[PDB]
Amino acid sequence: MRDAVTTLIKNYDLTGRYLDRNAMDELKAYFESGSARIAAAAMINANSATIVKRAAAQLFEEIPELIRPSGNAYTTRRFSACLRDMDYYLRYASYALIAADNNVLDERVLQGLRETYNSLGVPIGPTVRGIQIMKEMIEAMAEDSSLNSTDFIASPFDHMTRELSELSV
Amino acid sequence: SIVTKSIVNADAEARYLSPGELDRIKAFVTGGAARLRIAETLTGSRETIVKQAGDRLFQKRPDIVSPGGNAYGEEMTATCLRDMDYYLRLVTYGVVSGDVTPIEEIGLVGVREMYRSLGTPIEAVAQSVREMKEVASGLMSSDDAAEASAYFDFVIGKMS
Amino acid sequence: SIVTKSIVNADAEARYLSPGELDRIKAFVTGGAARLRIAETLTGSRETIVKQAGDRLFQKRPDIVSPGGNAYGEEMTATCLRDMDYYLRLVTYGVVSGDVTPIEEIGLVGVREMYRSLGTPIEAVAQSVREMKEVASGLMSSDDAAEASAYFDFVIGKMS
Amino acid sequence: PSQVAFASGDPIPQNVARRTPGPSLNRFKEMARQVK
Amino acid sequence: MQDAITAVINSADVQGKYLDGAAMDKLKSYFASGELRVRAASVISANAATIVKEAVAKSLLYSDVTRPGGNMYTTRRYAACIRDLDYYLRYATYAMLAGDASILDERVLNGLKETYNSLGVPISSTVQAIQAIKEVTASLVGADAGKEMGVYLDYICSGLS
Amino acid sequence: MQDAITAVINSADVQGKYLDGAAMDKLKSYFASGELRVRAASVISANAATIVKEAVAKSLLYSDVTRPGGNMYTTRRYAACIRDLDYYLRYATYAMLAGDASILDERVLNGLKETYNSLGVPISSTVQAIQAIKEVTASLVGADAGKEMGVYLDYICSGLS
Amino acid sequence: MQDAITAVINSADVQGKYLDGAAMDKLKSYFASGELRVRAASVISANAATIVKEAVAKSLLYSDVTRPGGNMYTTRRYAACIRDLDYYLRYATYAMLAGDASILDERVLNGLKETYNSLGVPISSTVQAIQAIKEVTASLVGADAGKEMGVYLDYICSGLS
Amino acid sequence: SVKASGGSSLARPQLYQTVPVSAISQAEQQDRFLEGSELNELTAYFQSGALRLEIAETLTQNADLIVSRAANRIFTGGSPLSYLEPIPPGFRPINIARYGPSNMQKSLRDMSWFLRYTTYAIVAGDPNIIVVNTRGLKEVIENACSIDATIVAIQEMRAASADYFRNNAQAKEIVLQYFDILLSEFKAPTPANKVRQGPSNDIQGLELPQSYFNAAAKRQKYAMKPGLSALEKNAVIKAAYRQIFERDITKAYSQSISYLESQVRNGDISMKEFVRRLAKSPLYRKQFFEPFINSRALELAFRHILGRGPSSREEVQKYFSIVSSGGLPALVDALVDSQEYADYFGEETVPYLRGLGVEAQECRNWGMQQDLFSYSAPFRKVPQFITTFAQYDRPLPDQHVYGSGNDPLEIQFGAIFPKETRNPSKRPAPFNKDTKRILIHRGPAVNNQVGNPSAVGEFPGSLGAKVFRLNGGLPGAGTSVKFGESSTQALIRAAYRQVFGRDLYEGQRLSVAEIQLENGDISVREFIKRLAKSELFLKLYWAPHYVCKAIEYMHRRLLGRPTYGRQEMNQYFDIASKQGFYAVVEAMIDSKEYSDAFGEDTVPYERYLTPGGLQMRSARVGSLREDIGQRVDKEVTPRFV
Numbered sequence A: 001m002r003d004a005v006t007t008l009i010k011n012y013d014l015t016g017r018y019l020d021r022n023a024m025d026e027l028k029a030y031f032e033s034g035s036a037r038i039a040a041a042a043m044i045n046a047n048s049a050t051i052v053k054r055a056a057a058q059l060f061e062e063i064p065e066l067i068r069p070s071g072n073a074y075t076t077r078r079f080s081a082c083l084r085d086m087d088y089y090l091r092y093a094s095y096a097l098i099a100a101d102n103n104v105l106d107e108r109v110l111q112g113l114r115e116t117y118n119s120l121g122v123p124i125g126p127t128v129r130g131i132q133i134m135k136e137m138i139e140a141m142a143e144d145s146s147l148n149s150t151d152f153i154a155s156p157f158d159h160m161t162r163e164l165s166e167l168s169v
Numbered sequence B, C: 001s002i003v004t005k006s007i008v009n010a011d012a013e014a015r016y017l018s019p020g021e022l023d024r025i026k027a028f029v030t031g032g033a034a035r036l037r038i039a040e041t042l043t044g045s046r047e048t049i050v051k052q053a054g055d056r057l058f059q060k061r062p063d064i065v066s067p068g069g070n071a072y073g074e075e076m077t078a079t080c081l082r083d084m085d086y087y088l089r090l091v092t093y094g095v096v097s098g099d100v101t102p103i104e105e106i107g108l109v110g111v112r113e114m115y116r117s118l119g120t121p122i123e124a125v126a127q128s129v130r131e132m133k134e135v136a137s138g139l140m141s142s143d144d145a146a147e148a149s150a151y152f153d154f155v156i157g158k159m160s
Numbered sequence D: 001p002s003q004v005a006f007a008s009g010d011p012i013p014q015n016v017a018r019r020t021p022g023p024s025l026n027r028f029k030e031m032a033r034q035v036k
Numbered sequence E, F, G: 001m002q003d004a005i006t007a008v009i010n011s012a013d014v015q016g017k018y019l020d021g022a023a024m025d026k027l028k029s030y031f032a033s034g035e036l037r038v039r040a041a042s043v044i045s046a047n048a049a050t051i052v053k054e055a056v057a058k059s060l061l062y063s064d065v066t067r068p069g070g071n072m073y074t075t076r077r078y079a080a081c082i083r084d085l086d087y088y089l090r091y092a093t094y095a096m097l098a099g100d101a102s103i104l105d106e107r108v109l110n111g112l113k114e115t116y117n118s119l120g121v122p123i124s125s126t127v128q129a130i131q132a133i134k135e136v137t138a139s140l141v142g143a144d145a146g147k148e149m150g151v152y153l154d155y156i157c158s159g160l161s
Numbered sequence H: 001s002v003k004a005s006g007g008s009s010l011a012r013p014q015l016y017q018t019v020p021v022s023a024i025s026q027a028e029q030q031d032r033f034l035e036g037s038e039l040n041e042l043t044a045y046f047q048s049g050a051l052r053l054e055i056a057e058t059l060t061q062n063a064d065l066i067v068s069r070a071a072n073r074i075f076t077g078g079s080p081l082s083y084l085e086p087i088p089p090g091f092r093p094i095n096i097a098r099y100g101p102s103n104m105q106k107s108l109r110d111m112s113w114f115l116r117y118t119t120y121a122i123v124a125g126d127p128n129i130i131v132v133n134t135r136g137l138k139e140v141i142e143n144a145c146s147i148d149a150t151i152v153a154i155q156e157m158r159a160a161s162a163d164y165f166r167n168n169a170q171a172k173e174i175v176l177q178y179f180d181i182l183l184s185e186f187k188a189p190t191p192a193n194k195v196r197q198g199p200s201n202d203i204q205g206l207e208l209p210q211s212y213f214n215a216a217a218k219r220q221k222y223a224m225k226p227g228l229s230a231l232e233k234n235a236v237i238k239a240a241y242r243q244i245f246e247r248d249i250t251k252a253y254s255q256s257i258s259y260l261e262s263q264v265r266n267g268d269i270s271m272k273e274f275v276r277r278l279a280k281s282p283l284y285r286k287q288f289f290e291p292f293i294n295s296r297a298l299e300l301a302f303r304h305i306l307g308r309g310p311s312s313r314e315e316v317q318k319y320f321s322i323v324s325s326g327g328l329p330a331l332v333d334a335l336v337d338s339q340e341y342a343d344y345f346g347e348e349t350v351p352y353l354r355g356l357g358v359e360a361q362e363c364r365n366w367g368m369q370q371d372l373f374s375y376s377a378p379f380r381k382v383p384q385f386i387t388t389f390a391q392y393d394r395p396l397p398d399q400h401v402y403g404s405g406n407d408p409l410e411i412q413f414g415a416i417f418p419k420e421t422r423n424p425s426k427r428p429a430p431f432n433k434d435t436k437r438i439l440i441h442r443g444p445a446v447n448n449q450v451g452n453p454s455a456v457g458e459f460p461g462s463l464g465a466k467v468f469r470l471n472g473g474l475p476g477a478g479t480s481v482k483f484g485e486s487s488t489q490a491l492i493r494a495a496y497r498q499v500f501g502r503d504l505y506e507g508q509r510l511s512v513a514e515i516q517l518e519n520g521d522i523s524v525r526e527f528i529k530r531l532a533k534s535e536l537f538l539k540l541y542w543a544p545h546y547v548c549k550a551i552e553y554m555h556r557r558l559l560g561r562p563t564y565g566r567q568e569m570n571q572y573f574d575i576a577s578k579q580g581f582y583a584v585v586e587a588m589i590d591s592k593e594y595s596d597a598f599g600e601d602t603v604p605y606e607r608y609l610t611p612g613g614l615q616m617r618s619a620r621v622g623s624l625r626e627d628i629g630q631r632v633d634k635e636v637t638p639r640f641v
C-alpha cells in the first residue's frame, strides 16, 4: 500500500533525488488537506450502514431486474452478498480518502476484481453504478455538513469506476 | 474527441500536432459553452424528442408495428424507443466531444451485425434517427441545430 | 546413486555438499571396478540365471503353473519368466549404481498394486527372486556373491 | 430393467422462455402505451 | 487512448447516463486548462530538437555511456537514443494535451522494460535523461506547464521502475 | 534429477536392455572423472562467496544496474541479485558433480525466464554476471574442471535466454 | 554473426583501441588457417548428402526410431529429420569457415531445444546422429579440419542436450 | 486499468443443498464409492420422490388460492388480488391504499416466492434453500414490512397448504415441517458475518454473510483425537495424506511413513507436528520440492499446509527468502508455525483447502488460487503468484494481446506455440483495443516505422535480413547459358523459404505459379499470394492452429512483423469469421503496409522482432556481445611496465 507521501518518495527515490521545492509544496498540500480528509472519513464512519443501504435501494430502484428472477441480487443470499460488496467499496474508499492516494484501491480492491466477478457472473456495470450512487450520497452529505474541502471525495470512487468498468471509447 | 483524434492523426505520422490542429482544438475549447448548452437542450427534451420521433417513425413505417414486424407489440415498440434513446444519448456524447468517435465506438462498429441478428430493419433505425434529428432541430436555434445535425447525419449515414 | 542422493539432500537444505558427503562420493567413485565386474557377471549369465531360477521355482511351487495358477499356460509361463528377467535387469542396475534407487523407482513403487490387479501372488515373485539369487551366487566368488545378494534380498524384502 | 435409463433415456426437453423487456424499460413502456 | 473528455464520456456511457452537472463541470475544467495546454504544446513542438539536445548534454554526453563500451557508443546507438528521447517528449506532449496518461500505458510503457532489457539499454541512464528533459522543458515553458509536463514525464519514468 | 550413472541406466531401461559395453564405458569415464569433480566441488564450496563477490565486482558494480533506477538499486535488490548468483553457482556445482544438467532444468530453469520477465530482471546482465562467475571459478579450479563448470553455467545462461 | 576477424575487431572497438600486436597475431593465425578451412568446406559441400546418409545409417536406421512408433517413422518425418541434419551440417560448415560459433546461436540453437521438446523429437537420438556426422566428416576431411568441424558440431550438440 | 490478470475460471458456488448432492459429495470428498449409508439415503429419497412431486404438484396448482388466503388474512380495506405478480400480539391488518402499490406488489411477490421455494425444498428433500434465503430476511424487510403480518401470512399459507393433505401423516407432516422451518427461519435474527481477518499488514481483512457459507458445500473436517475408533483414525490419516500429497498415495502406490502415523494416532505428536514431519519427508521432497524451482515449490507448499495460495507480493517475497535461506525444512517450519496455521487448524485438525464458500475470498489472488486448488497444479512449473503479483505492479508486458500462448517462437521455420494445456504457462494481460506492441527493427533503429514512417521499405543493410528482389530481367522477356536463370530461381526458392520457413520436399512446389512468374505473367507479390493461399500452406500453418495463432504466424511471414495489437488482429480475425483463410491471406497481402514495405518485386522478409525473439537470438553465450549489460573496463598496461 502507498499513500500520497509514499508515492512522492518513490518518485523521488527512483531518480535518487532529494526532495525539492515542488515536493515540499505537494507534501504541504496533503498536510493541509489532512483535517478535511479526516472529517470526511469520520462522517462516512457515522453513516456507513445507511449509506450502503440507501445506495443499494436506489440501485435496485434504477435497475429492478437485479432483484427479480435471474437478477444477480435475486434471493436473500445474493442480496446480502451485494450489500457486503457495497460495504467493501465504501470502507476502501474511506481508506483511499485518508491516504489521498488510490493505490490502496488498486492493491486490495481492483486487482483481480474483474476476474472474480466474471467467474461468479456478478455484473460489473450495476456495481459501478452503485459505487457512483454512494459517491453522490457522500458528496451530498459532505455538502450538508460543516466541511470546507470536499473536492477530493470523488477521487477514489471515480478511480474504481474507471478501473473496473468496460472501455467503451 | 477532437483532442484524441488529432493526437492519433499526428502520432500515425510521428509528428507533433500541427498549428492548424492546435488552432482547431483551441477554437473547440473556447466555444465549449455552446456545445455544453446544446447537449443540455438535447438531454432535457430527451423524452419528447424520442416520443415524437417514434410517432413519426411508426407513421412512416407502420409495418414494423404491424404484426410480423420487429417492433410489434408494446414490448418491442418500447425497446425500439429505448434504442432511439441510446442513439440520442450518443449524439450528445459526439456533440460535447467535438468528434464522432464516441458515437462510432459505442453504436456503429458492427451495428449491422447486431440488428441483422435481431431481425431489425436497419433502414428503419436510420429513419428514426432522421425523425429525432428533425424534432431536435425544432427545439434549438439554426446554428446549433446545424451543429447537432452534423452528428445526427453521421449516425444516419453510417446506418444506411 | 550416492551422488544424486547427496545432491538432493544438500539441495533440500540449500547448502553445498558437506566434506563428509564429498568423501563418500570419492570412495564410491574409486570402488566402481568391482561393481561393474559383478554387473558384467550377472548380465553375461542372464538367460542361464533366468531359466535355472524359473525351473527351480516351478518345481518348488507347482500350483503357480498348475490349473488355476496365475502362470498357467505357455504365454503365462513366458510372461512370468519375462518378469524374472525384468527383476534381474533391475538388480544389475542397482549393482552398477551402487544403490537400490533404480530398482525401487523402476520396479517396486506400487508393485503390490500392479500384481494385486493382475492376480499374481507377490510372495511367489519374491520366491522367484530368491531362486535367481541362488543361481547367480552359484556363478560368483563369495565377496561378489554377497554384494549381489544384498540387492537381490532388497528386492525380496520389498516384494514380501 | 429399462427404467434405469435417465441420461441414456429419451431426453425430456424443458421449457425455457425467451427473455422480455424488464422493468428498466418502464418509462419507454409507458411511451409505448402512448404511441398508438 | 482516453483524454479528459473521453474519460467523462466513458464514465457516463457505462451507466447509460446522460451527462449530469458534475460531468459538465469536469468538461469545463478541462476547457479552462485547454489554452495553457495548447500553448505549451506549440512551444515544445517548436523546440523539441533543442530540448533533447540540452537534455543529452546535461545527462549523457562526456560520460561512460558515450565512450567505447557504453550503450550510446557508435552512431547507430546514439541516433537510437536521441530518437527515444524524441519519442518520450512527443508522447508526453500528447498526454499533456489530452490531460491523461492512458496513451503512455497503451503505446509507451507496454513491454518497454522488456524491450530495453532485451536490447541491454541501461534503465537508470534513460531515467536520468528523461529527468533532464523534464527540467529543460520546465525552463522553456514556465513553472505551471513544466509541472504538468513533468507529471507525464515522471509517469514514463515510474513506468520504467 | 539424474546423474551420469542414472542417465545411462535410464537410457538402458527405456529400451529394456542390460548394460552393454558402451554403457559400461560411459560409467567408467564418469568414475574416472569423479575425483576431479569432487576436488573442484570442494574448491568451489570453499570460495563460493568470494567467487560471487569477484564476479559481481567484475561485471555489475559501477554500472547502470546499481544506480537509482537500475535493477540492483536499493539494498534489497542488491541482496536478491547476489543470492540469485549464489543459487546459480550452487546448482552449477551440483550439476558438475553429477555430470548431468538435469537438476538445472528441474530446480533452476523451469519457469525462471518467465519469473525474471515478470520482475523486470535484466537477463543479458545476468548472463554477463554468470560468465564472470565462470571465469573466476576457472581461475580458481583449473582449466579442465573450469571447462566442466563452464558447461553447466552456460547451460543456465542458455536456459535464461 | 561475427567471424574471427570481426570478433577481434569487436573486442578492440569495445575497448576503443587500435589493433595491437596480440590482435594482429590472432588475425594472422586465422589467415593462416583460412586455406585449410576453405579446403575442408569445399569437401563438405561436395559430400554433404553422403555425410548425412552415412551418419543416419550409422546412428538411426534399423532401430526403434525408424520403426512404427518412433519419431523418424513415416516418410514425412524421415524427410524432416534428414533435412534437420543437413541444416546442422551446413551451419557447422559456416561456423568452421568463420571460426566463430556465433552463427549457431543466432540462427540455429535459438529456441531449438524448446522446438524439439514441443515436437516430441528425441534429443539423444539427434545428438547421436550429429556425432555420427562428426565422425564421417572426420574420416572424410582429415584430423585437423576434422577437429575444427568437431568443435562446431559439438557446439551444436551442446545447445541441444 | 489493471496491468495483469490471474486468470478467470468458471466458479460454481452451491446455491442450496439437495439430497443427492449431499450424499454424492459425502462420498466424493472422501475419495471413495458410495457405501451403504449414502446409497440407502439415495434409495429412501428416490422412494419418497413420488410423494414429494405430488406435494409440489398440488401446491403449484393451488398456489393462487393459498396466496389469496394469506393476502386476505394479512391485508384489510380492499382486494390484494387486484395485481398479483399463533397470532403475534402486535399483528394488525395492513391497509392496501395506505401501504402503497410498490410495497403491495412486494408483499404478494414475497408470499408467492415463499410458497415457490417451499415447493423447491420439498422436492429437494432438504430445507437448506429455505434456511439460506430466509434467515435474516426479517432484518432486510423490518423497516418496510410488518414482521407480525408476514408471520400471520406464513401461518395462513402453512394451514392452507396442509389442508390439502388429509391423506395420512406422510404428505401433511412433510408440508408442516418445511413450513415450520420457514416460519422459524423468517423469525430468526440476522447472524453475524464470518470475519477472515488479515494475518498480517500485507493481507486485507474480509467478511462473508453467513447465508453464503450455509449455501456452499461444507468442507469435511478431520481432527485426530485419542479416543477415536481405529477406522476413524484411518480416515483422518488418509485425509492428511490427501491434503499434503494432493491424493491418497498410500492407496495408489503403498507409499507411507509408518512410524509417523503410529506416533500421530497414539497422540505422541499432534496433527500439526505430523503435518510438519510429513511435509519435510523425502516423499514430499521428491514429489513437491525436487521437481520444482523454489518459487513454484513455495506456492504448492502454501496449498498443502495452509489450504490457500499466497495472498500478496510481500508474502511470496518473505517465504521465497525463507526457502532460499533454509530450504524445504525452513519453509515447512515457517508455514506450520505461523499464527495463521494455528488460527485455522490448531494442533488436531488436518489442514483443508479453504477457497470459495468456506470463507471470504480475496480478488487479488482469485484466479491463481483457482488454478492452485486444481489437481493439475503439480504440472504447472512456471510460478503463478510471484509472476502475477509482480505484473500487477508493472506496466503491460511484451506479449500478444490475446496472451502469451499466441506468441510463436521466432525461429527460421515452424509455427511453434506454447500449448495451453501442456505445462500450463498462460499469462493473461488486459490489452484494450488501442494498445500498440513495441517491436525491434531488424536494421538501423532510426528506420523503425514508428519514429520514421517514411522509412518503410528502407532495406536494412548489414543490420537486417537479406532481401531478395526480382531486380534483374526475367529470362525470355533462344540461346543457352543465359545468366538470368540463377537469380530468378534463387528468388523462387527464397520465396518458398519465406512463406513456409523452409524449402518444400520434391513434388510440393507450385510449378505452374513458378513458370507463370518466370514468364513475366505475374509479379512477385502475386506469386507469394499463390504460395500463401496454397493448400499446402493451409494444411501446414492455417488448419492445425487456433485461429488467432494462425493469423499471427501468417502476419509474421507475410508482413515480416508481429501484429501491433487488437486493431490488426481484430480485422484479420473478423475476415476469418466472415470469409475464411483465402480472404485473410488476401487482406494481408493487399494491405497498404505490404505495398510500402514490399513492392511487386520484393520477396517479404523478417522486418521486426519481439523483445523475446531478439533476446532468444542475441542473449546466448556465443552471441552475447561483451558491452551489452555489463561494465566494460578499459585494459591498460600497468604503469610500472
Ligand SMILES: *[C@H](C)[C@H]1/C(=C/c2[nH]c(/C=C3N=C(/C=C4\NC(=O)C(CC)=C4C)C(C)=C\3CCC(=O)O)c(CCC(=O)O)c2C)NC(=O)[C@@H]1C
Binding pocket: A057, A060, A067, A074, A075, A076, A077, A079, H103, H106, H107, H108, H109, H110, H111, H113, H114, H117, H130, H133, H134, H137, H140, H141, H143, H144, H145, H146, H149, H150, H153
Ligand atoms: C410485508 C408485509 C411483506 C413483504 C414485502 C416486502 N419485501 C421487500 C423486500 C424483499 N423481499 C425479499 C424476499 C425474498 N428473498 C428470498 O430469497 C425469498 C425466498 C425465501 C424471498 C421471498 C427480498 C430479497 C427483498 C429485498 C430486495 C427487494 O426489494 O426485493 C420489501 C421492500 C423492503 C425495503 O426496505 O425496501 C417489502 C415492502 N414481504 C413479505 O414477506 C411480506 C408478506
Ligand SMILES: *[C@H](C)[C@H]1/C(=C/c2[nH]c(/C=C3N=C(/C=C4\NC(=O)C(CC)=C4C)C(C)=C\3CCC(=O)O)c(CCC(=O)O)c2C)NC(=O)[C@@H]1C
Binding pocket: A066, A071, A072, A073, A074, A077, A078, A079, A081, A082, A083, A085, A086, A088, A092, A108, A109, A110, A113, A116, A120, A122, A123, A124, A126, A127, A130, H013, H206, H207, H208, H212, H356, H359, H360, H361, H362, H363
Ligand atoms: C452488489 C452491488 C452487486 C452484487 C454482488 C455480489 N457479489 C458476490 C460475491 C462476491 N463478491 C466478491 C467481491 C470482493 N471480495 C473482496 O475481497 C473484494 C475486495 C475488497 C471484493 C470487491 C467476491 C470475492 C465474491 C465471492 C466470494 C464471497 O462471497 O465472499 C455475490 C454472490 C455471487 C453468487 O451468487 O455466488 C453477489 C450477489 N450483485 C449484484 O447484483 C450487484 C451488481
Ligand SMILES: *[C@H](C)[C@H]1/C(=C/c2[nH]c(/C=C3N=C(/C=C4\NC(=O)C(CC)=C4C)C(C)=C\3CCC(=O)O)c(CCC(=O)O)c2C)NC(=O)[C@@H]1C
Binding pocket: E060, E061, E062, E063, E066, E067, E072, E073, E074, E075, E078
Ligand atoms: C571534428 C572533425 C568536428 C567536430 C567534432 C565534435 N564532436 C563532438 C562531440 C561528439 N562526437 C561524437 C562522435 C562519435 N561517437 C562515436 O561513438 C562515434 C563513432 C565511434 C563518433 C563519430 C559524440 C558521440 C560526441 C558527443 C560528446 C561525447 O563524446 O560524449 C564535439 C563537441 C560538441 C559539443 O558541443 O560538446 C565536437 C567539437 N566539430 C567540428 O566542428 C568538426 C567539423
Ligand SMILES: *[C@H](C)[C@H]1/C(=C/c2[nH]c(/C=C3N=C(/C=C4\NC(=O)C(CC)=C4C)C(C)=C\3CCC(=O)O)c(CCC(=O)O)c2C)NC(=O)[C@@H]1C
Binding pocket: E065, E070, E071, E072, E076, E077, E078, E080, E081, E082, E084, E085, E087, E091, E107, E108, E112, E115, E119, E121, E122, E125, E126, E129, H438, H439, H440, H441, H444, H445, H446, H448, H450
Ligand atoms: C537514450 C536516453 C538511452 C538509450 C537508447 C537506445 N534505444 C535503442 C533502441 C530502441 N529504442 C526503442 C524504443 C521505443 N520504440 C517504441 O516504439 C517506443 C514507444 C514509443 C519506444 C520507447 C526500440 C524499440 C529500440 C530498438 C530498435 C528500434 O528502434 O526499433 C538503442 C539502440 C540499441 C542497440 O543495441 O542498437 C539505444 C542506444 N541508450 C542509452 O544508453 C540511453 C540511456
Ligand SMILES: *[C@H](C)[C@H]1/C(=C/c2[nH]c(/C=C3N=C(/C=C4\NC(=O)C(CC)=C4C)C(C)=C\3CCC(=O)O)c(CCC(=O)O)c2C)NC(=O)[C@@H]1C
Binding pocket: F060, F061, F062, F063, F066, F067, F072, F073, F074, F075, F078
Ligand atoms: C563509507 C561510510 C563506507 C564505504 C563505502 C563504500 N561503498 C562502496 C560501494 C557501494 N555502496 C553501495 C551502496 C548502496 N546502493 C544502494 O542501492 C543503497 C541504498 C540506496 C546503498 C547504501 C553499492 C551498491 C556499492 C557498489 C558500487 C556501485 O555503486 O556500483 C564502496 C566501494 C567498494 C569497492 O571496493 O569498490 C565503498 C568504499 N567504505 C568504507 O570503508 C566506509 C565504512
Ligand SMILES: *[C@H](C)[C@H]1/C(=C/c2[nH]c(/C=C3N=C(/C=C4\NC(=O)C(CC)=C4C)C(C)=C\3CCC(=O)O)c(CCC(=O)O)c2C)NC(=O)[C@@H]1C
Binding pocket: F065, F070, F071, F072, F076, F077, F078, F080, F081, F082, F084, F085, F087, F107, F108, F109, F112, F115, F119, F121, F122, F123, F125, F126, F129, H293, H294, H295, H296, H313, H316, H317, H318, H320, H386
Ligand atoms: C543479479 C545477477 C541480477 C538481478 C537479480 C534480481 N533478482 C530479483 C528477484 C528475484 N529473483 C528470483 C529468482 C529465482 N526464483 C527461483 O525459484 C530461482 C531458481 C533457483 C531463482 C534464481 C525471484 C523469485 C525473485 C523475486 C523475489 C521477490 O519476491 O522479491 C531481484 C529483485 C527484484 C525486485 O523487484 O525485488 C533482482 C535485483 N538483477 C540484476 O539487475 C542482475 C543482472
Ligand SMILES: *[C@H](C)[C@H]1/C(=C/c2[nH]c(/C=C3N=C(/C=C4\NC(=O)C(CC)=C4C)C(C)=C\3CCC(=O)O)c(CCC(=O)O)c2C)NC(=O)[C@@H]1C
Binding pocket: G060, G061, G062, G063, G066, G067, G072, G073, G074, G075, G078
Ligand atoms: C523394394 C520394393 C525396394 C527397396 C527397398 C529398400 N528400402 C530400404 C530401406 C528403408 N526403407 C524405408 C522406408 C519407409 N519407412 C517408412 O516409415 C515408410 C512409410 C511407412 C517407408 C516407405 C526406410 C525408412 C528405410 C531405412 C531402413 C530402416 O527401416 O530403418 C532398403 C535398404 C537400404 C539400405 O542400404 O539399408 C531397401 C533395399 N530397394 C529396392 O531396390 C527396391 C526397389
Ligand SMILES: *[C@H](C)[C@H]1/C(=C/c2[nH]c(/C=C3N=C(/C=C4\NC(=O)C(CC)=C4C)C(C)=C\3CCC(=O)O)c(CCC(=O)O)c2C)NC(=O)[C@@H]1C
Binding pocket: G065, G070, G071, G072, G076, G077, G078, G080, G081, G082, G084, G085, G087, G107, G108, G112, G115, G119, G121, G122, G123, G125, G126, G129, H411, H412, H413, H414, H415
Ligand atoms: C533427426 C536427426 C531427428 C528428428 C527430426 C525431426 N524434426 C522434425 C521437425 C522439425 N524440425 C525443426 C527444426 C528447425 N527449425 C529451425 O528453424 C531450425 C534451424 C534452422 C531447426 C533445426 C522444426 C521447426 C520442425 C517442425 C516443423 C517442420 O518439421 O517443418 C521432425 C518432424 C516432426 C513432425 O511430425 O512435425 C522430425 C522427425 N527426429 C528423429 O527421430 C531424429 C532423432
Ligand SMILES: *[C@H](C)[C@H]1/C(=C/c2[nH]c(/C=C3N=C(/C=C4\NC(=O)C(CC)=C4C)C(C)=C\3CCC(=O)O)c(CCC(=O)O)c2C)NC(=O)[C@@H]1C
Binding pocket: H258, H259, H260, H261, H262, H263, H265, H266
Ligand atoms: C507385539 C509384540 C505386542 C503388541 C503390540 C501392539 N502395539 C500397539 C500400538 C502401538 N505400538 C506403538 C509403538 C511404537 N510406535 C512407534 O512409532 C514406535 C517408535 C519407533 C514404537 C515403538 C504405538 C505408538 C502404538 C499406538 C499407536 C499405533 O497403534 O501405532 C498395538 C495396538 C493397540 C490398540 O489398542 O490398537 C498392539 C497390538 N500387542 C500385544 O499383545 C503384543 C504383546
